[PDB]
Amino acid sequence: WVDRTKEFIVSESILKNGETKRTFKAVDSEKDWIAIKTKTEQEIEHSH
Amino acid sequence: LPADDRKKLTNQITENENTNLRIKALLAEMMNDHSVENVRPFSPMQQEILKIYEDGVLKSDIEIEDDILKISKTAQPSSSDLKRYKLWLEQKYKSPYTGQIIPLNKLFTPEYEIEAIIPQSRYFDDSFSNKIICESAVNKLKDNYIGLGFIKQFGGTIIELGFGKSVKVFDTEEYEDFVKKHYANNRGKRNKL
RNA sequence: UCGUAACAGCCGAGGUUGUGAAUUGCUUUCAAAAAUUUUGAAAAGCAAUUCACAAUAAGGAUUAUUCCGUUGUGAAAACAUUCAAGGCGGGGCAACUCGCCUU
């Protein structure tokens, strides 16, 4: 992890006290493609 | 069967072989103990045990030896779950036709045998719900046709089980309440008597 | 209480093999050179990162914006599929799709 980048998909979950628990899971394409597709579309839209 | 009715049928049959495994393991543990007698392959005594171990569905239960019921193999020799199962499951089962607990050793004795709720000279059911076990005397005195007249006519009769021990037929005054509530398991079979 | 559960249909993104390309690599071969040792050029085999493209069950039709090719029957090397009209109407700028009424 020292001076290195990691790829995660974060599942936000707000608890009773309002704490949005950030849960990190390893990303693996071909199964959870919805998130990566939305990310790519957002990136394309941002560039205009 | 359809698919939905098919997927369940595996469960009952598999539980059946689990029960058979437990029955023969229990008998292999019993032949080391001098209850009365244990031959080995004699199927009728295995059936009698398979009908006498149903005390679990007879109300009172504890969770300690509950995994032992659902398991199939258990531990057989020496200090084992089979031993403690025998200790707890030794007398917690009363006779249907006399309302007396059975030490589970007098089962193989000729004085006690398999009782058919419906006679052979009548409906030809062979399901386990038409099979119980009780004394030989009441089996001899049942005289095919079942209940009503005879069960109310002979109510209160005292019959000797041999060797000076005499037992009384259900007093109908108490036996009506017995056949109403006492056998609270009441799956589908008690009322048909 | 049985039955429904099976059959079909419109699409996506990769991967693999191969062709071409840019850049590097490993091994092998004539020496071109140095004073028995290395530097080497060029080819061959094997790849790597990235791009474009071809094929994606062997193969056979067809020019319809259609396909057949892992199911079943059984020798006949043979088959299974579809089935005219008339409006009423819903949807859709469009192609077209979906229901009702009548022989």
Nucleotide nearest to A37 (CA to C1'): C13
Picking from A44, A6, A46, the residue whose alpha carbon sits closest to that of residue A26 is A6
d(CA B186, CA B124): 22
Instruction: Give the number of other Cβ atoms within 10 Å of residue B55's Cβ.
Output: 20
Contact in structure between B93 and B106 (CB atoms under 8 Å): no
Contact in structure between B49 and B27 (CB atoms under 8 Å): yes
Chain C nucleotides close to protein (CB under 7 A) are: 2-6, 13-14
d(CA B99, CA B178): 9
In chain B, where do the E strands start and end? 112-115, 132-135, 158-160, 166-168
DSSP code, position B57 = G
Task: Report the distance from CA of residue B155 to the C1' of nucleotide C88 in Å, as an integer.
Answer: 81
What approach was used to elucidate this structure?
cryo-EM
Rg of the Cα atoms in chain B: 18
Picking from B141, B152, B34, B153, the residue whose alpha carbon sits closest to that of residue B86 is B34
Query: How many CA atoms lie less than 13 Å away from B75 in the CB half-sphere?
Result: 9
Task: Report the distance from CA of residue A29 to the C1' of nucleotide C46 in Å, as an integer.
Answer: 32
Q: Is A8 strand, coil or helix?
A: strand
Instruction: Give the number of other Cβ atoms within 10 Å of residue B107's Cβ.
Output: 20
Nucleotide nearest to B2 (CA to C1'): C3
Two structure tokens written together for A37: 């597709």
d(CA B35, CA B24): 16
Two structure tokens written together for B184: 């609270």
